[PDB]
């Protein structure tokens, strides 16, 4: 997260951390007691997932869980076309007890609204090249289907949407992949891609447009 500040501890309790030999590479969102949703590009064969974290050290966080997952279902349309349909569902080994530090979120039904300020959160690089010690948060505003095709053609797929590129240079950075973008209490997107470097003035990030994917996510999680 570029130009955010520290999240209020346990304020984003649906946040999952994907770590690989103790080192975070992606975030996810708990969207059901057995299912973390993340970036299809975040695919691994096995996951270690932090729940209910703030700092990335389990012991130092009371209510924290380190679960394991052997299993993920990438959207069958992932990377067709390229960068498109960037979502997958990680089934957890065991379902888990909601607490106050750990909670599922509903996904948005309507499509994002141009101008809508939304919150993004994760542990990816700061403005200064360094990794944050505690979960970060920033407010980015949805941009328009037009400014997002202009910025990103011929790779814009209606399964993405763009947000940020304000004056004040708020954006997602490396390690924020598959983390959440909350619009009006609902899960509206996940962190996917953008131009490189992060935080280019007037350059929004792209987010998996989850309004497209509700029937696939419902229908998958019941089976």
């Amino acid at each position: 997260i570029i130009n955010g500040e520290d999240c209020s501890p346990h304020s984003q309790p649906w946040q999952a951390a994907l770590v690989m030999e103790n080192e975070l590479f992606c975030s996810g969102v708990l969207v059901h007691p057995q299912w973390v949703l993340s970036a299809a590009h975040c695919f691994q064969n096995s996951y270690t997932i932090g729940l209910g974290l703030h700092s990335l050290e389990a012991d130092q966080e009371p209510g924290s869980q380190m679960v394991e997952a052997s299993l993920s279902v990438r959207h069958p349309e992932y990377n067709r076309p390229l960068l498109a349909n960037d979502l997958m569902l990680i089934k957890l080994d065991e379902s888990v007890s909601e607490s106050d530090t750990i909670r599922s979120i509903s996904i948005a039904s309507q499509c994002p609204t141009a101008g809508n300020s939304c919150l993004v959160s994760g542990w990816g690089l700061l403005a200064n090249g360094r990794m944050p010690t505690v979960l970060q948060c920033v407010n980015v505003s949805v941009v328009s289907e037009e400014v997002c095709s202009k910025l990103y053609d011929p790779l814009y797929h209606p399964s993405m949407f763009c947000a940020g590129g304000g004056q004040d240079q708020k954006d997602s950075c490396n390690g924020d992949s598959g983390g959440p973008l909350i619009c009006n209490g609902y899960l509206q997107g996940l962190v996917s891609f953008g131009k490189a470097p992060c935080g280019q003035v007037g350059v929004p990030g792209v987010y998996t447009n989850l309004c497209k994917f509700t029937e696939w996510i419902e229908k998958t999680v019941q089976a």
Binding site: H41, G124, S172, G175, S177, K195, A196
Partner: protein
């Protein structure tokens, strides 16, 4: 699926760090810029046995991940992160054929990928971001090795993190 790892077993980062492409065979050589013949400035990527650091590279994906999988389309480039002066492309250039040259310009999705080949990794070019890939290998001319498409004769690299710098 597959994560690219440096000579220490650590994931190669996405742009954050720089690495030396260290030929498994040609240990001596290190990457550098050169003219192929008689054009105004040296844009062509080579291994020069007379330079034993070489210029390290940075691998970028637009995806907001802090690692590189063998399946990601990449931009490869020299110099620091901000900078887009040292960005690899494949341009037709007789006598060599399909050569690796730098531009100061960049696409969002680079045309390369890093794949395992025996002892370490090869760089692979994907014409038209398509399904079939051409190994980058070498052409010896003018007393260095020019990087260029040589499907089936890949030049194999281990990736050494530069935290010397």
């Amino acid at each position: 699926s597959s994560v690219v790892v440096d000579t220490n077993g650590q994931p190669v980062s996405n742009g954050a760090d720089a690495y030396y492409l260290v030929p498994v065979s040609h240990g001596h050589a290190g990457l550098a810029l050169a003219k192929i013949g008689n054009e105004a400035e040296p844009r062509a990527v080579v291994l020069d046995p007379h330079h034993r650091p070489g210029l390290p590279v940075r691998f970028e994906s637009p995806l907001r991940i802090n690692i590189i999988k063998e399946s990601y389309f990449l931009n490869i480039k020299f110099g620091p992160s901000s900078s887009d002066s040292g960005v690899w492309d494949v341009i037709q250039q007789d006598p060599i054929g399909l050569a690796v040259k730098v531009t100061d310009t960049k696409s969002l999705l680079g045309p390369f990928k890093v794949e395992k080949e025996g002892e370490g990794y090869k760089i692979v070019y994907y014409p038209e971001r398509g399904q079939t890939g051409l190994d980058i290998g070498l052409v010896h001319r003018n007393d260095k090795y020019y990087l260029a498409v040589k499907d089936g004769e890949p030049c194999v690299f281990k990736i050494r993190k530069a935290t010397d710098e």
